Amino acid sequence: ASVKVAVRVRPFNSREMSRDSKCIIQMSGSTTTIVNPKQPKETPKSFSFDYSYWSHTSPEDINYASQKQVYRDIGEEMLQHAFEGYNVCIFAYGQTGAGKSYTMMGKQEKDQQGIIPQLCEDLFSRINDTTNDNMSYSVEVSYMEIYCERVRDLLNPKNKGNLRVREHPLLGPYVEDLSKLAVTSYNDIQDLMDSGNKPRTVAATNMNETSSRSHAVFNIIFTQKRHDAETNITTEKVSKISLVDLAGSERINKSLTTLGKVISALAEMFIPYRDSVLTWLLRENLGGNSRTAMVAALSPADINYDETLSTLRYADRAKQIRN
Ligand SMILES: Nc1ncnc2c1ncn2[C@@H]1O[C@H](COP(=O)(O)OP(=O)(O)O)[C@@H](O)[C@H]1O
Numbered sequence: 001a002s003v004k005v006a007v008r009v010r011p012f013n014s015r016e017m018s019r020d021s022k023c024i025i026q027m028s029g030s031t032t033t034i035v036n037p038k039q040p041k042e043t044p045k046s047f048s049f050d051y052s053y054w055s056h057t058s059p060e061d062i063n064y065a066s067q068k069q070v071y072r073d074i075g076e077e078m079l080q081h082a083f084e085g086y087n088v089c090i091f092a093y094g095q096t097g098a099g100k101s102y103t104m105m106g107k108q109e110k111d112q113q114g115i116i117p118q119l120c121e122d123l124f125s126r127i128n129d130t131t132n133d134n135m136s137y138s139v140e141v142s143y144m145e146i147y148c149e150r151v152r153d154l155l156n157p158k159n160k161g162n163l164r165v166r167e168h169p170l171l172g173p174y175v176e177d178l179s180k181l182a183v184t185s186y187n188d189i190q191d192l193m194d195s196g197n198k199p200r201t202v203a204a205t206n207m208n209e210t211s212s213r214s215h216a217v218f219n220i221i222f223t224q225k226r227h228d229a230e231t232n233i234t235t236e237k238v239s240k241i242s243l244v245d246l247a248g249s250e251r252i253n254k255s256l257t258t259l260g261k262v263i264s265a266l267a268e269m270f271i272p273y274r275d276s277v278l279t280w281l282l283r284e285n286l287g288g289n290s291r292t293a294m295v296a297a298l299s300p301a302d303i304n305y306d307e308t309l310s311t312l313r314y315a316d317r318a319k320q321i322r323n
């Protein structure tokens with residue numbers, strides 16, 4: 001099970017339009033190419049991945065890769081492996097402003113919902129059209145924010161002490177005292193999500209908007225319970241689903257700086273697992289038993305060459321890592 005990687009170029013934003021930024025990214029099939037504005041003479045570097053999403057224009061274009069395309073490409077495939085019983089993960093990596101959340105959460109407003117909102121809807125919908133009767137499900141969600149090696153229960157604002165990430169002698173890492181709520185409908189789960197997104201570190205310098213030096217981890221513990229029409233035992237399947245929103249790149253955020261090391265290591269294959277909490281919490285989902293996929297968002301702007309390239313490179317290695 002080799003990690004699957006996809007990159008995505010968004011449309012110009014407020015900053016870029018001011019600087020009259022030219023676009024340096026081009027896409028064709030499964031390949032992305034970036035140009036060096038400083039060195040327009042040499043030949044642009046190319047990159048081939050599982051998916052190169054071109055979303056620089058708008059939904060009116062025939063070649064715009066909408067939230068539906070992304071979801072159905074990776075989302076529907078991971079939620080699957082989740083049903084086949086595997087643990088799964090999807091995380092958005094990249095420079096801040098490149099589009100990491102939009103690919104994950106997006107804007108509920110009219111079909112803009114991203115990977116998380118859509119995955120849940122898909123799950124709860126699958127669970128329901130299951131008119132079988134030997135099948136019983138359960139779904140428990142958790143949402144947290146990891147800023148400064150500090151875990152924050154985004155669904156229990158009442159608590160302000162940073163939750164302690166611990167290692168179980170026999171079961172692995174887990175965040176002590178972390179909300180784990182059962183959800184019976186997508187209407188119920190959608191709500192919680194709405195909450196957590198808000199409860200997010202207000203922080204400033206970001207304009208008083210969900211500052212992003214921390215990771216928004218969205219865990220979905222899906223439980224399948226099959227009944228054996230004879231012996232009254234129930235085969236219980238259990239798969240964990242993590243949907244991460246990594247703080248921007250740009251370059252302390254140990255976690256990010258550490259995930260790179262692991263990524264690279266995984267690409268060179270022991271690992272500085274405990275070196276960071278993000279990794280530690282995603283021990284398996286990162287390099288253990290589970291199928292992982294990363295979505296690297298990319299700024300089209302020429303003013304972000306050194307940060308767009310970098311992302312292409314970290315995305316590049318990720319392609320290798322195999323679980
Ligand atoms: N694929 C996309 N289509 C349209 N707008 C996008 C896309 N990706 C990013 N954006 C725009 O950029 C803004 C920020 O993107 P965001 O999800 O916050 O990225 P980040 O991962 O950098 O935090 C949003 O307000 C959104 O309108």
Ligand SMILES: [Mg+2]
Nearest residue numbers: 100101102212
């Ligand atoms: Mg975001």
